[PDB]
């Protein structure tokens, strides 16, 4: 099924393929992707990536 | 406290 994150802290993307995330947003449908340490998702009708540990899984 | 986030791939 699929996986959303809470934000717990923000983030300004610093490279064209990330998120800026926002305190309090919910990121939905997160994947693992081949990447260490950051996870995608959709966030506001785009896609991204996002460090995991700004974040909070939704369990 | 607040968290860096870990290097890219790159």
Redesign the interface.
């Known amino acids: 099924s699929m996986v959303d994150y809470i934000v717990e802290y923000d983030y300004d993307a610093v490279h064209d393929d990330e998120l800026t995330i926002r305190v309090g947003e919910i990121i939905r449908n997160v994947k693992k992707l081949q990447e260490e340490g950051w996870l995608e998702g959709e966030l506001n009708g785009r896609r991204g990536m996002f460090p995991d540990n700004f974040v909070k899984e939704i369990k | 406290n607040?968290?860096?986030?870990?290097?890219?791939?790159r």
């Open positions: 607040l968290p860096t986030a870990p290097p890219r791939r």
